[PDB]
């Protein structure tokens, strides 16, 4: 932690006097002190870094995006001074990149990370941070290149292994991803004890038919990442009643359920008219959840936002649902038609959050061949009837009928969420 250059050593008493104000929680006094030092010693890297750290603390205290933007600029100013110690330069830009990601400036974060790697090309850990940068904007191709270079220099870096494995799995290279995820988690390196990697390791093992999969679910549950071996969502509010199957009465949404069941044929008829006359509005499932088959969805609400063009194709259904904010305001759910054809098998999986319950209304249900398992219980749909399950539990679907199967999916807020939580939880 060598932070002082030749000059900063001669003014260390003034620098320490300012930092002491910051460590003693006197943030506003600290900012003014470091501002004065910056004004008096405009080339001091330690003074400039002190100003940035005080601005950083001030933004936390005030919860101000505008103050944090100021800190992010001051962190950069440190890097442009002459004679900056390498440790100070690294610390300053790293914090800058971190704070850019916090604000959602992912492109800015990436440029900072590319500068850090150009300045310190032998620093493996900075390359790992850059790979994460790419993963956050969904750029799996560039993330993959970065971790390949890291695994070339240091083959047993456990952080690079799990992220490499995560990318392979996301690219549907299931069997290839398993040794990277497994060895990465077993390395115990910092950053590998993460629920995402246990989730995808157990799932890749389930898909290749490896019984060891449930060992990792149980280890993930023992390490605190999963509520149970069955319930493996990662964006959770703790304490919510956890139960695979729900009756209408237990949810308290009886008016919504009665409305769906009383009016189900109207919902069916608008779904069939879209199939027949606007089938381009049904989009294929795009989350790699199928082993095989054809499965498409026509989405009316997503993240609590009404899809206006979609509601032009199902206007009476959209009018009916407007009455029920417990589903239309569910920012962690959707409302959508779901069509599935014969020969379809949906892999076991869970949704991302325990904050919703998922209702299925049967619209066109073949007499045989269609079933849904949630946890250890298999059920089937009925036309005009609502089924309710918590899709944060492992569930699986088969379509082996002789014709198409159409249902209506309505997500509601978990009933035990308070209104404060419903309005403040980030959308998913």
């Amino acid at each position: 932690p060598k932070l002082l250059n030749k000059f900063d050593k001669t003014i260390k008493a003034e620098l320490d006097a300012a930092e002491k104000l910051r460590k003693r929680g006197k943030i506003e006094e600290a900012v003014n002190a470091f501002k004065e030092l910056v004004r008096k010693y405009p080339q001091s890297p330690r003074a400039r870094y002190g100003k940035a750290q005080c601005e950083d603390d001030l933004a936390e205290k005030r919860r101000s995006n505008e103050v944090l933007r100021g800190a992010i600029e001051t962190y950069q100013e440190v890097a442009s001074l002459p004679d900056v110690p390498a440790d100070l330069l690294k610390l300053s830009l790293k914090r800058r990149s971190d704070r850019q990601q916090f604000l959602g400036h992912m492109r800015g974060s990436l440029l900072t990370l590319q500068r850090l790697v150009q300045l310190f090309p032998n620093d493996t850990s900075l390359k790992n941070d850059l790979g994460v940068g790419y993963l956050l904007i969904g750029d799996n191709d560039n993330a993959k290149k970065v971790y390949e270079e890291v695994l070339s220099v240091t083959p047993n870096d456990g952080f690079a292994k799990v992220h490499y494995g995560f990318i392979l799995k996301a690219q549907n290279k299931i069997a290839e991803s398993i040794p990277y995820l497994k060895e990465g988690i077993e390395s115990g390196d910092p950053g590998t004890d993460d629920g995402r990697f246990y989730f995808h390791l157990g799932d890749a093992m389930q898909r290749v038919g490896n019984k060891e999969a449930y060992k990792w679910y149980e280890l993930g549950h023992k390490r605190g990442h999963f509520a149970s071996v069955w319930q493996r969502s990662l964006y959770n509010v703790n304490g919510l009643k956890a139960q695979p199957w729900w009756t209408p009465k237990e949810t308290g949404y009886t008016e919504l359920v009665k409305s769906l069941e009383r009016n189900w044929k109207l919902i069916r008829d608008e779904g069939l008219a879209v199939m027949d006359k606007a089938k381009g509005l049904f989009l294929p499932e795009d989350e790699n959840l199928r082993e095989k088959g054809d499965w498409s969805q026509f989405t009316l609400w997503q993240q609590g936002r009404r899809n206006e063009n979609a509601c032009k194709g199902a206007p009476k259904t959209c009018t009916l649902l407007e009455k029920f904010p417990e589903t239309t305001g569910c920012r962690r759910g959707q409302i959508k038609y779901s069509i599935m054809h014969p020969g379809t098998h949906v892999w076991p999986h869970t949704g991302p959050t325990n904050c919703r319950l998922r209702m299925h209304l049967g619209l066109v249900i073949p007499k045989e061949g269609c079933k849904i398992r949630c946890a250890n219980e298999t059920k089937t749909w009925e036309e005009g009837k609502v089924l309710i399950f918590d899709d944060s539990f492992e569930h699986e679907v088969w379509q082996d009928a002789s014709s198409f199967r159409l249902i209506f999916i309505v997500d509601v807020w978990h009933p035990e969420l308070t209104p404060q939580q419903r309005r403040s939880l980030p959308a998913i």
Binding site: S233, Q303, T350, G351, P352
Partner: peptide
């Protein structure tokens, strides 16, 4: 990408500061 039915993205939420 968004996490609708599954957990396939590296992150499912969006960061918007404070």
């Amino acid at each position: 990408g968004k996490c609708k039915d599954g957990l396939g993205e590296y992150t499912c939420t969006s960061l918007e500061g404070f």
